[PDB]
Amino acid sequence: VTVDGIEFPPTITPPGSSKSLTLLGAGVRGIEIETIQIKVTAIGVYAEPEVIASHLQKWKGKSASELVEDDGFFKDLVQAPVEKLVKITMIKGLKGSQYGGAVEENIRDRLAALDKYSEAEEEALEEFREFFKTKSLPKGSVIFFHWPSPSTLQISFSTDGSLPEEAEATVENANVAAALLGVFLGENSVSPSTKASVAEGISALLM
């Protein structure tokens, strides 16, 4: 499986973890320059297939096109209490503070909309901001977002693109954790391509 020349492995064990997760789908974050789509990142989404399948039973029989159009499906996915991992490979290089500010803005907008942005969420976003502050994210580098639990976010990163040995940082906050996942799979998604791919992955899995 490859996305814009970036191959996503069928499985990944999250940094520091023992549980092997399976690729559900992958896509890109696209931004436009005067109507032209530019690919900035490739995004791969991983979870435990047997396990996540058992929380999404209600969606069996539905095709990819049907899941894609159903917002409750992605909500289930986001909310499902199983281990998840998102692997992001940079296609255009960015400053960590740029990548980090963009994600933070997305999350904050989501928390605001849900009316779930209080002091705790602010402090968690600070930790998230702190992670990317002095980092550079060149072409080919990789960020790992790992949700061992829906309220626990573990982050790591390698300039190399190689798999970190361990998680570098942990952010403990249910709302921010879930909103970040939503950046990818949610109403607040930056990547319709990833969502369509994950839908196509899960559809096939449920049959």
Structure description:
It is built from 7 helices and 11 strands. With 207 residues, the chain is α+β, with helices and mostly antiparallel strands. The strands form 3 sheets. A 7-stranded antiparallel sheet has the order 3-4-5-6-9-10-11. β1 (2-3) and β2 (6-7) form a beta hairpin. The longest helix is centred in the middle third of the chain and has 18 residues, at 96-113. It is globular and about 45 Å long.
Key phrases:
monomer; 207 residues; alpha+beta; Chalcone isomerase; 10k-s Protein, Hypothetical Protein A, Chain A; 2 domains; two-stranded antiparallel sheet; 7 helices; 11 strands; globular; isomerase; naringenin; monomeric; Engineered Chalcone Isomerase ancR3
Derived from helix and strand composition plus strand pairing, the structural class reads alpha+beta
Query: Using DSSP, what is the number of strands?
Result: 11
Distance between the termini: 20 Å
Number of domains: 2
Strand content: 25-35%
PDB class: isomerase
Keywords: naringenin, flavanone
Assembly: monomeric
Entry title: Crystal structure of chalcone isomerase engineered from ancestral inference (ancR3)
Quick take:
The chain has about 210 residues and is α+β, with helices and mostly antiparallel strands.
